[PDB]
Amino acid sequence: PGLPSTEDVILKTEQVTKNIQELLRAAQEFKHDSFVPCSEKIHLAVTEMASLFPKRPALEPVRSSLRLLNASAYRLQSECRKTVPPEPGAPVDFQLLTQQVIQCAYDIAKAAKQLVTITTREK
Amino acid sequence: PGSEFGHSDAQTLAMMLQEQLDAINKEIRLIQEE
Numbered sequence: 001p002g003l004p005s006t007e008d009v010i011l012k013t014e015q016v017t018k019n020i021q022e023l024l025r026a027a028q029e030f031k032h033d034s035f036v037p038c039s040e041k042i043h044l045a046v047t048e049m050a051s052l053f054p055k056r057p058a059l060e061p062v063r064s065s066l067r068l069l070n071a072s073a074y075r076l077q078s079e080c081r082k083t084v085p086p087e088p089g090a091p092v093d094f095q096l097l098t099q100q101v102i103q104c105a106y107d108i109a110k111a112a113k114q115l116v117t118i119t120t121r122e123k
Numbered sequence: 124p125g126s127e128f129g130h131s132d133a134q135t136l137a138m139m140l141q142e143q144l145d146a147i148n149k150e151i152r153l154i155q156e157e
Contacts, residue, residue: 006154010154010155013151068124099133099136102136102137103126103136106139109140110143113146113150116154120154
């Protein structure tokens with residue numbers, strides 16, 4: 001296993017951005033109930049993109065960008081679980097929540113972009 | 124490391140996220156033209 005094709009990276013990146021775009025829409029339209037399923041679709045898209053790369057990447061920038069990608073997806077998943085408290089309707093700071101959620105998506109997109117750039121420059 | 128955003132509001136964050144997404148689409152477009 002080596003570096004994936006630019007076409008494959010673009011395909012998985014577009015799935016990530018599409019799902020992030022839907023999350024941003026949910027935040028803006030106050031679909032706070034949609035945060036968990038959105039994050040799951042994002043987390044899945046992230047896993048598939050990460051799987052394009054070797055289990056142990058040789059390139060230092062791939063290692064770094066994958067770390068950011070994976071950590072931010074996990075962080076997002078952690079944040080979105082607050083939209084489904086065990087007691088339905090429990091107090092939640094939706095301003096703080098939305099802020100944290102968008103921060104996570106920002107870094108996911110950031111990492112995804114870096115991976116696109118890395119892949120293209122090696123072709 | 125992860126990005127530091129301090130106490131940025133959702134409005135500012137949404138803008139920067141959208142800018143990030145726009146940059147990705149623009150880069151992909153540039154790649155598919157060469």
